[PDB]
Nucleic acid binder design. Structure first.
Ligand SMILES: [Mg+2]
Ligand SMILES: [Mg+2]
Ligand SMILES: [Mg+2]
Ligand SMILES: [Mg+2]
Ligand SMILES: [Mg+2]
Ligand SMILES: [Mg+2]
Ligand SMILES: [Mg+2]
Ligand SMILES: [Mg+2]
Ligand SMILES: [Mg+2]
Ligand SMILES: [Mg+2]
Lengths: 293, 205, 170, 159
RNA sequence: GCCCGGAUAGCUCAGCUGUAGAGCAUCAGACUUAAAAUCUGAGGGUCCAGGGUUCAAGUCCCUGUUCGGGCGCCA
RNA sequence: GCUUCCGUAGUGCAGCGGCUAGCACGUUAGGCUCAUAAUCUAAAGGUCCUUGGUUCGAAACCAUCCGGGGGCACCA
RNA sequence: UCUUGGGGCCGAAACGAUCUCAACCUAUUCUCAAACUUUAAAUGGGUAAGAAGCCCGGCUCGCUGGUGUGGAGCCGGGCG
RNA sequence: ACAGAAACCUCCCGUGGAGCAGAAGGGCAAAAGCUCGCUUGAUCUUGAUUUUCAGUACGAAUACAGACCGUGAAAGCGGG
RNA sequence: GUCUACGGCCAUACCACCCUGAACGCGCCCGAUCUCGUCUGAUCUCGGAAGCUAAGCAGGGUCGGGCCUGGUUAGUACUUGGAUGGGAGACCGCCUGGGAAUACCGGGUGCUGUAGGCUU
RNA sequence: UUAAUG
């Protein structure tokens, strides 16, 4: 036989890590550099723009750290896009751009900067930064929070970053992780970035599947056929989506119905119930031994 | 040979054991710390007697060896070869030093390791003999003859416990009857109600 | 009624050739693995110098390649055609995976090259299940659970139901 | 003689407690430090930059300077003839707030509330802290049973 | 620190910018019945390391690393 | 006790972490001889004193252990 | 228990069986540590126990800044 | 498969029982360890502070500031 | 009642096994054209939505291990100050305050901040 | 040149 590694001494010496580290959500080495403020700033809120790309959603929030918990000053979800004219395609690069633009315009509407700092309306994809206007309230600045997503070239986190920058958030960024930047010859192509923002990669793959075979076409894109999405409709649909986002960025919450107040969960067993259970198990074992013998 | 025990009779220094730092220590004479019939159960040797010290001193390993032989000989003469169990409950770890003078003198005076000695507290068991209930005055006589090998003064106390256990003799039979204790050789196993119920079913099945 | 998410598939097929000598023998074993797969294998170097066999530290000893999917299924079909659809009890691991080694690669169907020569290769089949991608990913790490593991009995009955392979004790 | 190193005899002192190793908690980082706050010092072995000295471990001073990732603090060191109010620059990890100032501020706020109260009334309520007095006479009610007679136990040797 | 010698095949030494030589040693053939003694061919040169001039450098030029031989000694 | 050194086939020695440990003798086997020797041709044979450490690697470098050999042991 | 093995025993042999004896594993048990420690005192060492303190109103800043934001410095009062 | 106590591959457990050049102690797990990609913050200049201390130097270090820079997408990190 | 995203305190939160998950979600899952990276689309990245709670995840259970918090140990060990107290010493007793930690026996098994859902 | 012994 061999020695058991996980012994009582192992559980006595075992230190647990943090809860978000055990869940695998927070990179605390990155959070140590991100979230803390310099001590000579004296409770100046340090804003980070958090992007989390889920399987079916793109969460874009803006947070500043407090000691009880970092409060979300503004949030934007990808399922709000059917209100703006994007029925389907909620987890791609164009929806990341629209969610970042929606977060930016909603934050400027809540701060009262709708007319000032318009941003990019005729978006091409060039290197753009929000310059502060003199004699006006200053531009909002924040710093990007990707999290545990590996930041390679062509990431939806950087698509949401480009959406926030074009909506008018002064975020420092380089044109290296945006799609279009060639890794070999090292120059940035803005036309390829415009195609990825407006979604012509999805349209080209749609046309490629339509040329190849209808079965793999219907296997890959089903709700695009259900909601009548064609490649010629794609760029105009995202233009109307950008126009609707820049037109009405405010959010109305859903009305809450009175709760029926029932418990789907199974409640916790009490001490008297546990003491009764062990007594019934012992009595059942004794009467089974008496019945067998 | 070596020095008299009047020199290192009392606890003078810090406890200085054999370790990574203190190397080059000769082996102690006492190595077999129990004898008699140690391959035995708890039920067949009820009576237990202890040699309890009454001084905070240092008992040498050679004195432990001499008292072990002196108790062994009388227990073989009285109780036979398989009718007792002696246990020395003092393992000597304190490495004690020697300053041999062949002329340097007191300059650079730190001892080379001379031998081993056991740090003994007041009210601490030196030796312990478990035996049958008939052999009471024989164990008193054996411990009385073993007292002469040690310096100082120690008392002989016949314990209320059942052998080399921490449980009383009037309660031991009731606990074995209600299956709270299991005979496990020299020692005993105490089963609480804290474990899982599969252990309870394996006991009562 | 068996749940369709518990269909015991194959994760990978691990090929390796350990010639113990760098240079020409090693690169021709790499050519053997490349002609077997259709992809370039990776050379595995040593951990420490062993003067008994004639190896040194950071010296390229072996060559290996992991194959996924229908290509791994077809190469494992070739390997069981070589080993006539039979394995032993001790070849099966307690973690749920298995493996075996052929004598030489000419039994697989590869034509002999007088420039390359004769090289044997070693199969290791890592079986799978939908939901094994939790432990190796970055987003939400964690153990896969007790019901989701593959046992040795479950591997034996899968092999006997899939390839109709007899299993003999030894 | 002894060596005069920076971390001589700091085996247990800068060591982290049991099952408290690893990542430094972040509220300690983001807790803000104003000028003139009474601050006690407790060293930490995880972050080696900006450590205080072993003579200042446990000492308590107040903040005079605040920088980006550290603050300066004037602590009182007793050196061989006199106490000197001398200043040291300590990073954030080795710094907590002292609640001896906070309890005093709560007592000042309570005294200000009690001073604004009962001014138009005229009742003179004591504001100073009065120590633990000799207690007032009281009635011990030995209802029912008589007091239990304590008997000293006889000697019996346990060992 | 200055000056001048050498460091080249396993060893001791030559080598005038255009297959690096002489001797000892090893191997392989003669000789003797055989080794050794003595002939015959063959193999073995990071020319101490790097850089510079030149069409071309072991050689000419400094730069450094070892080894002698003598001088010189204000932190 | 202090400082220092050595400890390698059977014997006396070498050995510049990477060997097949090297030379001589001894040994054994075969020639020569009538035998022996000498001579000639082959071969066997090292726990590298012991433990550990450094090292990718230790016969050596580092530490201790057990052996051994020299120099000191002083004025009063 | 075969996780392995030294001597056997019936075995050509076989984790087939067999009494074991050794290391290993699991629950115990005796004694310790100046250069060990989960815990952990007594004594002790810092700090505070107010006018240099609170509560107001306003200026300045080239520092920091969605925000006459934050911080610091100046003033003019009221509280004993 | 050769392959064995040890050459290579895979799976499972694995709070650090490894490593961080060295003596020991502390500290460190999506790191302070290993491997990659780019660099020379191991650059220049004032001042302040700690340690040794007489509260003097030297050595070592600690926070900042003014410039030029490296890396990263950025927060930042770095003046051995 | 409960989830997701970002968190605070970092086991009352961990670990082993078993049971249940309505709706949104979270995931498992389907492929490599484009961005991207590998021996390998396994990881990462990208484009999706046929199937599924099998797993992660959420809740609960184990006379569960661990952990947290109390009693016991025990006014015990120890300890500030005192005596022309004892004893050959070793050490011990008393006056004056202060006061532990194992084994053993109970209880518990995450609270909470911001934003957004679901049970309409 | 070497070549001793029974
Ligand atoms: Mg990161
Ligand atoms: Mg209903
Ligand atoms: Mg002493
Ligand atoms: Mg890193
Ligand atoms: Mg480093
Ligand atoms: Mg600077
Ligand atoms: Mg896939
Ligand atoms: Mg599930
Ligand atoms: Mg389930
Ligand atoms: Mg429990």
């Amino acid at each position: 036989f061999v020695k058991v590694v996980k012994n009582k001494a192992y559980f006595k010496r075992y230190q647990v890590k943090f809860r978000r580290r055990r869940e695998g959500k927070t990179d605390y080495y990155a959070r140590k550099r991100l979230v803390i403020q310099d001590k000579n700033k004296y409770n100046t809120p340090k804003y980070r723009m958090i992007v989390r790309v889920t399987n079916r959603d793109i969460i874009c929030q803006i947070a500043y750290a407090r000691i009880e918990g970092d409060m979300i000053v503004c949030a934007a979800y990808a399922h709000e896009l059917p209100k703006y004219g994007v029925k389907v395609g909620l987890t791609n690069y164009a929806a990341a751009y629209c969610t970042g633009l929606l977060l930016a315009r909603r934050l400027l509407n809540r701060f009262g900067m709708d007319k000032i700092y318009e941003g990019q309306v005729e978006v091409t994809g060039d290197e753009y930064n929000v310059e502060s206007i003199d004699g006006q309230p200053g531009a909002f600045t924040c710093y990007l929070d990707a999290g545990l997503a590996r930041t390679t070239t062509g990431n939806k986190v950087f698509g949401a970053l480009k959406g926030a920058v074009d909506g008018g958030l002064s975020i420092p960024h380089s044109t290296k992780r945006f799609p279009g930047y060639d890794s070999e010859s090292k120059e940035f192509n803005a036309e390829v970035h415009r195609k990825h923002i407006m979604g012509q990669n999805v349209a080209d793959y749609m046309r490629y599947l339509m040329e190849e075979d209808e079965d793999a076409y219907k296997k890959q894109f089903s709700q695009y056929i259900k909601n009548n999405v064609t490649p010629d409709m794609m760029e105009e649909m995202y233009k109307k989506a950008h126009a609707a986002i820049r037109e009405n960025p405010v959010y109305e919450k859903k009305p809450k119905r009175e709760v029926k107040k029932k418990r789907w969960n199974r409640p916790k067993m009490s001490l008297a119930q546990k003491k009764d259970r062990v007594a019934q198990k012992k009595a059942s074992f004794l009467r089974a031994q008496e019945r067998a013998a | 040979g070596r020095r008299p025990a009047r020199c290192y009779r009392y606890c003078k220094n810090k406890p200085y054991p054999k370790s990574r730092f203190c190397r080059g220590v000769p082996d102690a004479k006492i190595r077999i710390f129990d004898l008699g019939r140690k391959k035995a159960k708890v039920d067949e040797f009820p009576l237990c007697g202890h040699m309890v010290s009454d001084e905070y001193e240092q008992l040498s390993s050679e004195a432990l060896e001499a008292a072990r032989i002196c108790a062994n000989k009388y227990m073989v003469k009285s109780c036979g070869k398989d009718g007792f169990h002696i246990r020395v409950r003092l393992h000597p770890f304190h490495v004690i030093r020697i300053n041999k003078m062949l002329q340097t003198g007191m300059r650079g005076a730190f001892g080379k390791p001379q031998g081993t000695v056991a740090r003994v507290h007041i009210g601490q068991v030196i030796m312990s003999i478990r035996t049958k209930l008939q052999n009471k005055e024989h164990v008193v006589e054996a411990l009385r003859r073993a007292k002469f090998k040690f310096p100082g003064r120690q008392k002989i106390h016949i314990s209320k416990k059942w052998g080399f256990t921490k449980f009383n003799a009037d309660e031991f039979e009731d606990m074995v009857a209600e299956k709270r204790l299991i005979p496990d050789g020299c020692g005993v196993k105490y089963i609480p109600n804290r474990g899982p119920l599969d252990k309870w079913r394996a006991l009562h099945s | 009624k068996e749940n369709p998410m518990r269909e015991l598939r194959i994760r990978k097929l691990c090929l390796n050739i350990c010639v113990g000598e760098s240079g020409d023998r090693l690169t021709r074993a790499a050519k053997v693995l490349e002609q077997l797969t259709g992809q370039t294998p990776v050379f595995s170097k040593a951990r420490y110098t062993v003067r008994s066999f004639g190896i040194r530290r950071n010296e390229k000893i072996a060559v290996h390649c992991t194959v996924r999917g229908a290509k791994a299924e077809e190469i494992l079909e070739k390997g069981l055609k070589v080993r006539e659809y039979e394995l032993r009890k001790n070849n099966f691991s307690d973690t749920g995976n298995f493996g075996f080694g052929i004598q030489e690669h000419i039994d697989l169907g590869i034509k002999y090259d007088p420039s390359i020569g004769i090289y044997g290769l070693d199969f290791y089949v890592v079986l799978g299940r939908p939901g094994f991608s939790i432990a190796d990913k970055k987003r939400r790490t964690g153990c896969i659970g007790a019901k989701h593991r593959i046992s040795k009995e479950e591997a034996m009955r899968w092999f006997q139901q899939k390839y109709d392979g007899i299993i003999l004790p030894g | 003689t002894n060596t005069k190193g920076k971390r001589r005899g700091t085996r247990y002192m800068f060591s982290r407690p049991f099952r408290k190793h690893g990542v430094v908690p972040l509220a300690t980082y983001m807790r803000i430090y104003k000028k003139g706050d009474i601050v006690d010092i407790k060293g930490m072995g995880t972050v080696q930059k900006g450590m205080p000295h072993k003579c200042y471990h446990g000492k308590t001073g107040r903040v005079y300077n605040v920088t980006q990732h550290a603050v300066g603090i004037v602590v009182n060191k007793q050196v061989k003839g006199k106490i000197l109010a001398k200043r040291i620059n300590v990073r954030i990890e080795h710094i907590k707030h002292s609640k001896s100032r906070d309890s005093f501020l709560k007592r000042v706020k309570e005294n200000d509330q009690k001073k604004k109260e009962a001014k138009e009334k005229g009742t003179w309520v004591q504001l100073k802290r009065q120590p633990a007095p000799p207690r007032e006479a009281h009635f011990v009610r030995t209802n029912g049973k008589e007091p239990e007679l304590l008997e000293p136990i006889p000697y019996e040797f346990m060992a």
